[PDB]
Amino acid sequence: MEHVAFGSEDIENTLAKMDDGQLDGLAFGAIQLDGDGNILQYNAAEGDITGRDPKQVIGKNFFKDVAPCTDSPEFYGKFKEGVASGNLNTMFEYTFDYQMTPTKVKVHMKKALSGDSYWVFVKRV
Ligand SMILES: *C(=O)/C=C/c1ccc(O)cc1
């Protein structure tokens, strides 16, 4: 076995129905979004490094109301491509340095199978 897997234990499935402790003990924050970039879920992993938390970032747009860096052609860019492609599936090396310290993370976002969503999993590096 290797370290925590990015795709990990079928996140999307565990994020549509949640797991034991809402699978918040992962190493990659799992966030969802609804046709606009409105957070649907966030989990405690990423929210534990920055403190965002889901109940707090709930309603906050993860593109401009939570992270002002994801509103670019590399983060929201591949998101506007996956949303218009009908199968969001992209990743990229990003750095969360918003009002805080310099964070590094390998991102991996895909099209949630809940019916039509968009989740961005950030795996701290
Ligand atoms: C860009 O500045 C992103 C910042 C960010 C993303 C995710 C988090 O949990 C915290 C900050």
Curated annotation (Swiss-Prot):
Q: List the SUPFAM superfamilies.
A: PYP-like sensor domain (PAS domain) (SSF55785)
Q: Which GO terms describe its molecular function?
A: identical protein binding; photoreceptor activity
- How would you describe the post-translational modification of this protein? The 4-hydroxycinnamic acid (p-coumaric acid) chromophore is covalently bound via a thioester linkage.
UniProt-listed GO biological process terms: phototransduction; regulation of DNA-templated transcription
Taking every annotated instance into account, which residue ranges of this chain make up the domain PAS?
23-86
Question: Which InterPro entries does the record cross-reference, listed alphabetically?
Answer: PAS (IPR000014), PAS-like_dom_sf (IPR035965), PAS_fold (IPR013767), PYP (IPR012130)
Instruction: Indicate the secretion signal residues.
Output: none
Please give the PROSITE patterns that the UniProt record associates with this protein.
PAS
Pfam families per the record? Answer: PAS (PF00989)
Question: Which CDD domains has this protein been placed in?
Answer: PAS
Q: List the disulfide bonds.
A: none
Which Gene3D superfamilies does UniProt cross-reference here?
A: PAS domain
Q: Which residues carry this modification: S-(4-hydroxycinnamyl)cysteine?
A: 69
Assigned keywords, A-Z: Chromophore, Photoreceptor protein, Receptor, Sensory transduction
Q: Belongs to which family?
A: Belongs to the photoactive yellow protein family.
Query: Which NCBIfam families does the record cross-reference, listed alphabetically?
Result: photo_yellow
Q: How does it assemble?
A: Monomer.
Briefly state the protein's biological role.
Photoactive blue light protein. Probably functions as a photoreceptor for a negative phototaxis response.
What is the protein name for this chain?
Photoactive yellow protein
What taxonomic ancestry is recorded? Answer: Bacteria, Pseudomonadati, Pseudomonadota, Gammaproteobacteria, Chromatiales
Q: Report which gene this protein is encoded by.
A: pyp
